[PDB]
DNA sequence: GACATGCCCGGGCATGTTTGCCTGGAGACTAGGGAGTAATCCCCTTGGCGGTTAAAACGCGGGGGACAGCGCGTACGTGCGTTTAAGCGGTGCTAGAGCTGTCTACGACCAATTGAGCGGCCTGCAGACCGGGATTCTCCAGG
DNA sequence: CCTGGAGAATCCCGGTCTGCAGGCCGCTCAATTGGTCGTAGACAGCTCTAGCACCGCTTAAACGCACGTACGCGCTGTCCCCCGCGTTTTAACCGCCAAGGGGATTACTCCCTAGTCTCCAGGCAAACATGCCCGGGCATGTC
């Protein structure tokens, strides 16, 4: 049902990501390259979440599991709860 | 769920009156209080498990303190830790 | 104003066993006076004739007289001396005989005296006692009241106690009695439908 | 049966010390809390939470904002060397980075 | 006419969102990356609305952190414009993948 | 302000055989007055006639004054001062008789005294005794209660006793004798409400 | 008694357009004040409230005054006086700044003047004159009637006139209007009747 | 008393668009003070605080102050001076600033200045005007009740008007506007009654 | 005058495995030291994520699911597959014998 | 009384069931232990155990020898990338490092 | 009673640390540098294994002191217990 | 004379330690280095032999993999001698 | 007889205080954990002597680091045009969240007995040493 | 400069010899296992409700795309100096050996602390008490 939705990242979104870091001069690579490193990070927090949900039997991903997720991986995130 | 934002706001009035604080900040102090919270809690709880004890004691919580907190915070918290239960035992 | 002590009201028959008796009138629209027994009650127009007759088992003594007086009925009012409200006193109604403030008058009587006692502010009228005539076992006398019970500042809707007392010459007690009136108007209507809720 | 006293309130301190005692003896922490326990955690956790507040608060005054937001506490825990470390992985809510650019990159 | 100077553009920009503090990327788009990774794993799942903010706020958390880091490899070798040799240099140093 | 001491409320006849008497009023209700033997309190409006009888076993000498005093019923009023409260106090309702400031009054007599105590701060009315008929067996004297108990200030929702003392000439107590009252705006429903609440 | 004269109730709005005005009150049976457009007519209950308007073309020069004075609307009793029943001239219910006799009265107002007319014997109660604001259209005046239309003695049932005059400074007349008036016990109830009465 | 003018409450938001503002508390049992948009009613407790925000288009110029005064709805009731009941004008809690009669009060601000109009015997505070502190868009004032709409004597359950006049130093008006106000001990209970009320 | 304190180890049943995929292979106590190290270090592992599983869903229990879902938080993919199949195994048997 | 069966051998493991339970009940994990916790948690150390020891073995023969020594263990762990990801902060006594040299640095 | 230690970790030392590393050419201001980052390594070991042993009472620091101090700072040792 | 070209012993002797196992640090000048950094904490501290050892292993194993990245650093700035610059971004990349 | 007019009772709202439930602290007793003492004795510290590897030192010379120069290509900046994300609604209902009942589950204890740990010996593997030679690296002629 | 042959050095292989570690066996105590009992945490069904999902229209801020120019990266050459490799010399580490006793450990006894159980005070919400207002019906005068 969804597809391709990783090209929604606009190149100007990478930009703007990169020029928060510091960034001055950007290569084309950099894009595809940005990409490739977002979905590994996302989908290893999205597959931690979903296993918590599994486990706590709903079938809806709360805030907390995405806390949970985070959290363990070194990424201990506030303003969410904790 | 309990949460703390009672007592984070009272104790900012205590060292800016005049100040407020924003929804979103305030919970970002619960997840601190919190966080802090399970650190000393786990690191006292395995040093009472190292040394086969069993009774979490003020010693625990505070070498426990010196392992997560840097120096300079280290010894004023041990400063206050140390006059909240001198105060306690004493009252 | 307010009187310095209330009139008395005990029912006192007498050695002479005195009593008092009434007509039989209807209860039409067109009725000036009525009595209804079951309640003691007289139903009147303002200013009209009211016969009562004084039944008696002897004869009292030459010299008796027959004194009329009226209190209301309600013990906290009685102080009120029962007059003519400030309307019927200054109006230009006294026949000559009656003050323009009191409120009962006898008619067809010369020999009337009407009374403003000086100690009670108490207003009575008296008339010398007559024997029954020949083919009557009873004295009627004929009374007018001069306020309905409604006027405002007089009696103002409270209803009195017309006292009859028979006194002698120096004044003193041979029998008392008394009746409830309602001075109104149209007392053939007021009887009929009292008398309806009597017998439900 | 004299009048209570709250165990906060009887050591000075502000953050409640009967709910630490339920915390520190829940969640698996130990088999058992010694009485001295909870007051000296509570003192910690409200000095440090003086600390961040404090800091926090000149950082606002330095917007001229009559209220604290997520920004000036990423402001205080990062100024702090001390706090950086102990907050060294957390990850505020809108609190946005310092603004340092190397000396590389200026012009010239 | 007038044209910045190639670069001055660049700091002004650095300096404007170095001091902001919104979301950079869009947030209905990365809501259909979110959903269009998870699928993969399960069908049917639903998300709270601070759930996905609560992975946007990580995820560019992370790239900000990892632009610094491939910064300042392109400053090592002395060249103004980063490279995925910068990026996957940095990532390699931490031991990420 | 607060009174330095606190009236005797004990009943005491004396040589008289000095007792109450109430009447029998129904419960509708807004009955201007109505008194209920089972709490032995008084139900009446504000400025309303309140009925009170007076029985003795022979009749006092002459000069004899009958006086009403009002205290609160709980212990931790007592020392207060029951006086209106400061709204009734600047109204214009005085009937030339009584103060302004005076909770008690008495209707229908004119021969009324009122009393400021000098030592106690207490208020209290007067009137000289009067005998009974003879066919009746007490006299009954009308009060008046100028404030509602629910008046701020003064009574403030906060019961209160009327004490009736039989006084000589001079002041010295022959009899005394006590009634819970409420001044309220609906007497016979206040009334059948505790009555109700009685019988739990 | 009898005046020697009868006010003038032409109306004359003069050189400041001078009129009247009046609320839209509902018709429940015991509304304090309702006025009846159909009848130019007012209702209201004894002392209470009477709202009354005062429209102008020009505001009027400082110092202007307004009269009011009764008479009976009545042909044949234009000639007496329009004042209280003997029972409530009698009474003791004067504000301090009334008259007893006087029928009307103003309330709220601190400056009012009540005058009894030596030489026509009529009584009338005058106020200054005071302009509504920029956005208003009409100033509104409060009297107070002291007796029922039904006073015996008094209005006795007929209907008055209620009118008002702008005066100035020194008396003189400047406008005049008037408005029939019943004081009763159930205004909108007689309001709602008498209309539904201009129907049937 | 009485007062010898009537305040003005015509609306005008001025060439600075001058605005009130209230702030959007809830109507829980523990509400202090809360404001109903849809009734442009403020429901608050008695001597509590009552923010009230200004807005304004335009920052007035140096001097301008800002007036509070309150006046009955009911125009029969305007000529009275709005003030607290005789009880709470007796009891003992003054501020200090704050006469004890007066019925609204500022906190906060030593600047206050209460008036006791000397030609119109109106109660009134005034502070002066400042623009919003740095970080805010408006300026909010402290205001506090001392009587219950249901004070008897006193307002005595007649609602009131809050009337806010943004003037400059000399007194001349700049602004005003105004808002309902109902100082009762549930707040929260009354404003969801009232509301519940005109969902319905 | 005792000689010495009471230890444990998983030294025999290391022993064991090995000979099972090697019969013909010892293993040196170096070695040995350091696969005791690993089985305690797993089982920290494991033993702390079940404990949070059962604490965020507010259980008391420790069941055989917490330590299937930790286990799958914790080990990689593949190893994952194949630790919940023994797992699934034992509890099975288990039950059944 | 029966003759009594161990549990481990009631799940046909090799290593043991009722250690695994008290380990689980101690350590402040959680206040009650499942029957069938341990027994799943003993198959998943097993299998873990067996996975090093196999390719440890492998590592063995290819340097002839007849016993798994700590460089072994070593070279076991990082051969195979999803052990070395699990291990990935651990380090090895004596384990030494593996025989990588950049391309870069080879002459030619 | 002992200084000027940390010379003892000799040039040729470093250079074999470098060898397993994959370093073919060392410059020799790399000797100096090493020596700061062991000595900072060292000083936060050493003081965590210390404070173990301070809480314990005891006086000698055993293997289990350091691989405490080790694990917590993200780096597990096994062969030494623990 | 015999001799070879610079590189080639540097070379060979990767491949000799990347071998072995042993420590590539003296053992007794480690000693007093962790002795002389103790002090500092408190005095009259003791130690066994297997804490000592636990050291070593801890310390050689950070150098070595801090030196792996810094030759990494090294590489990526088309160079092959390691430089003290070299091993300040592989700190600082890691949070050191 | 029909109408006109006022007062009493009943109903229902308006308004303030009393009564009931949940959470935290106080008071008292029982059993285990912690503390202290006495003792053992294993392990760390220390010192000696001799042998020798490793470290220190100096020297040469080649390779790598470095700076400077030139080419051109990728990137940035700007403009106009196109897209769809935000916003502000409306609508439906799935699924989260909480409650109440009941049961199977694990904790707890006691009694019985096998598994695991420590101490005690012996052979095979691994290490060490020496000689052989196969492989790797470097320099010199030929083309 | 590129390719091939020869010399030299290092590494690897094979055989012999020696010492420590691995593996096994025997014994003893505690822990695992059996089998009862008890209490309740967790499953289950049930319900109310919130929050998510879907859809629509409108505004316009943001994203696309295309063109023009230039700063930037890359390659090249040429110094030159820094590090490598080698031999020589000096220093400290390793090794084996022995002794002293301080500190960790174990065992035994006693005292204080924390857990468990029971009861009281403060905060929050609903019910009761009581005054005020409106309408209906009857009483009573007028026509």
């Given at each position: 049902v969804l597809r391709d939705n990783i090209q929604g990242i606009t190149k100007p979104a990478i930009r703007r990501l990169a020029r928060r870091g510091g960034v001055k001069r950007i290569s084309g690579l950099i894009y595809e390259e940005t990409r490739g490193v977002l979905k590994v990070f996302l989908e290893n927090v999205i597959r931690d979440a979903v296993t918590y949900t599994e486990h706590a039997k709903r079938k809806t991903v709360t805030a907390m599991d995405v806390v949970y997720a985070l959290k363990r991986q070194g990424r201990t995130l506030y303003g969410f709860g904790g | 769920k309990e949460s703390y934002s009672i007592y984070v706001y009272?104790?900012?009035?205590?060292?800016?009156?005049?100040?407020?604080?924003?929804?979103?900040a305030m919970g970002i102090m619960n997840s601190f209080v919190n966080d802090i919270?399970?650190?000393?809690?786990?690191?006292?709880?395995?040093?009472?498990?190292?040394?086969?004890?069993?009774?979490?004691?003020?010693?625990?919580?505070?070498?426990?303190?010196?392992?997560?907190?840097?120096?300079?915070?280290?010894?004023?918290?041990?400063?206050?830790?140390?006059?909240?239960?001198?105060?306690?035992?004493?009252? | 104003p307010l009187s310095s002590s209330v009139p008395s009201q005990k029912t006192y028959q007498g050695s002479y066993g005195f009593r008092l008796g009434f007509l039989h009138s209807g209860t039409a629209k067109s009725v000036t006076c009525t009595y209804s027994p079951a309640l003691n009650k007289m139903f009147c127009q303002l200013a009209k004739t009211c016969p009562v007759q004084l039944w008696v088992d002897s004869t009292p003594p030459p010299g008796t007289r027959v004194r009329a007086m009226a209190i209301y009925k309600q013990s906290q009012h009685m102080t009120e001396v029962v007059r003519r409200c400030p309307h019927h006193e200054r109006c230009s109604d006294s026949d000559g005989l009656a003050p323009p403030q009191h409120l009962i008058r006898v008619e067809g009587n010369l020999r009337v005296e009407y009374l403003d006692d000086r100690n009670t502010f108490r207003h009575s009228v008296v008339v010398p006692y007559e024997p029954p005539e020949v083919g009557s076992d009873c004295t009627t006398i004929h009374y007018n009241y001069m306020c309905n019970s409604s006027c405002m500042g007089g009696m103002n809707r409270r209803p009195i106690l017309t006292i009859i007392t028979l006194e002698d010459s120096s004044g003193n007690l041979l029998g008392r009695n008394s009746f409830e009136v309602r001075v109104c108007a149209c007392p053939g209507r007021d009887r009929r439908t009292e008398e309806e809720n009597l017998r439900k | 049966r004299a009048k209570a006293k709250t165990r906060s309130s009887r050591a000075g301190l502000q953050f409640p010390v009967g709910r630490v005692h339920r915390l520190l003896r829940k969640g698996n922490y130990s088999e058992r809390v010694g009485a001295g326990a909870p007051v000296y955690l509570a003192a910690v956790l409200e000095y440090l939470t003086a600390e961040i507040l404090e800091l926090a608060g000149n950082a606002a005054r330095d917007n001229k904002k009559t209220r604290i937001i997520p920004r000036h506490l990423q402001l205080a825990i990062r100024n702090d060397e001390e706090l950086n470390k102990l907050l060294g992985r957390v990850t505020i809510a809108q609190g946005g980075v310092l603004p340092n650019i190397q000396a590389v990159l200026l012009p010239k | 006419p007038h044209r910045y100077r190639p670069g001055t553009v660049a700091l002004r920009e650095i300096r404007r969102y170095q001091k902001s503090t919104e979301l950079l990327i869009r947030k209905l788009p990365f809501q259909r990356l979110v959903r269009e990774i998870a699928q993969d794993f399960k069908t049917d799942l639903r998300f709270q609305s601070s759930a996905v903010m609560a992975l946007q706020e990580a995820c560019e958390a992370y790239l900000v952190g990892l632009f610094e880091d491939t910064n300042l490899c392109a400053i090592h070798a002395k060249r103004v414009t980063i490279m995925p040799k910068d990026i996957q240099l940095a990532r390699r140093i931490r031991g990420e993948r």
């Open positions: - | 009272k104790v900012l009035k205590q060292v800016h009156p005049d100040t407020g604080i924003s929804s979103k919270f399970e650190r000393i809690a786990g690191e006292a709880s395995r040093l009472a498990h190292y040394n086969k004890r069993s009774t979490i004691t003020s010693r625990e919580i505070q070498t426990a303190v010196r392992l997560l907190l840097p120096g300079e915070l280290a010894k004023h918290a041990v400063s206050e830790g140390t006059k909240a239960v001198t105060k306690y035992t004493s009252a | - | - | -």
